[PDB]
Amino acid sequence: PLESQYQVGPLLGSGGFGSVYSGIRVSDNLPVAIKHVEKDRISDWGELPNGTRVPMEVVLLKKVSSGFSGVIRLLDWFERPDSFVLILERPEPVQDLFDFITERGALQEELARSFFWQVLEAVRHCHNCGVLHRDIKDENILIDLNRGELKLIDFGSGALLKDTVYTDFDGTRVYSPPEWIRYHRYHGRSAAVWSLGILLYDMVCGDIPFEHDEEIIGGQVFFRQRVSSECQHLIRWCLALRPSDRPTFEEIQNHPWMQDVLLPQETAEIHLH
Template sequence: MLDKRSVELHLEEEEEIRGKHVKESFDSQYHCGPLLGSGGFGSVFSGQRLSDGLQVAIKQISSDRVQQWARLPGEVSPVPMEIVLLQRLSEVGGHGGVIRMLDWFDVEGRGFLLVLERPPHCQDLFDFITERGALPEQLALRFFRQIVEALLYMHDHGVVHRDIKDENIVVDTRTLDVKIIDFGSGAPLKETMYSEFEGTRVYSPPEWIQSQSYKAVSLTVWSLGVLLFDMVCGDIPFERDQEIIGATPIFTRRVSKECQSLIRWCLSYRPEDRPTLEEVLSHPWMEGGEVEEEGGDLQEDHSSLPSQSL
């Protein structure tokens, strides 16, 4: 028969195994506010941490919508892959260009709740471009460099995002710093081919359209080419599968030769012809910041920079 001390130790160990989410409920630590937005992988609400008033975002994921499950050390039950990937990045110190997960909960009847940092004055890049039109190359370069550096960090720590697009980048409209969000399509990084894809089709490469397979880096670099085109031209280059397979962007605005060459390199039809992330960073357009501003087709910088009132 167990004595009282043994029972207490047993209970402590059990709590330790099951993790901190057993000890304090979500509702005792956070207030969940209005809906901010929803998508294929869940809904996002504004929220507040009760202990200090910190503004957070709360992502709710229904268990029946989870595409991939994985296990965390010390957790008995599997959790959505998104939690595992964000936890992995958090444990290695995080990166300024990647949204940080502060906590997570498995709540009966509500699914999984992810508590995420919520930077002030933020707007997603899709809305940023929709409001301002095509971005001046210097501003596009500022955003793009931050995104590529954040992706390099993620890959270095074994995470591939697989859904890089303007809607998954948020811009701090005062500092012009950006962060990558929404890891719902993410996966552990591997060298071999992937045969599943939950990302956005118009950002996917020809090899996915044609053979339903791809490698992590070549997929990521193709989506970066689509994103950079989107920033400097105001819209994505391809809408239909045949256009993606054609892999020939048609520039609708005056764009410098160096910027065009980087976009075309990222959008090479053959995956092996695309650059690595390191090669993207060392491309002359990225390194020099020397941008041709010929003619009047480019918007003036001032009209495209964010308002302080946002």
């Protein structure tokens, strides 16, 4: 029972991730997002403890969807003959962070601090659950505009977290670290931290720092906007060319720029309402 269980609304969008629709659960009018992806387009597969063959995204989402977190939770999923369908939480009202930055331009540091901190907490949650997202970027972050909470989306390029080297990467190129560009090798946490430096820069400057491969591996960070020296210092540490020179998640959250973060609700009151 799929169409009996969900009222399908308009298409929100489509791309490499599949096709995503607005929907509501009929049993209680809960807003949902309904994501369709063709089996032909799924390269990465896993299986459920009970021996069922599902896309890796379902395995990863099940792992992170227990309890409250800054991750959009998987509520349900269906197999069809030629596709899988995912039922996901939908905040309302909602705007993705790419859109928000496009509309508002570069964020005030107070807002970027709150947003960055919530992304850090969500990524820590994922890593605690054994999951690597591998496509952290503004487009994969939803803002709940009334509650001021950020939520991570799109685990379709993720992997189980391991301590050994990754040699595959189907995430967003310009959020990809210099060691991937140069060697097709990265480790999970240090690459994630690179993607976080790219994201923080994006928030405070209003655009990503590097366009082409040559800039990524040169790793020279130029600021287009006025940015505090403490925030510049954190960004530059995250974007260290050597992965071992990058900060741990703890070191980021203990950085001076990260102190005195606003709560979600006060973030929404001051900056979103």
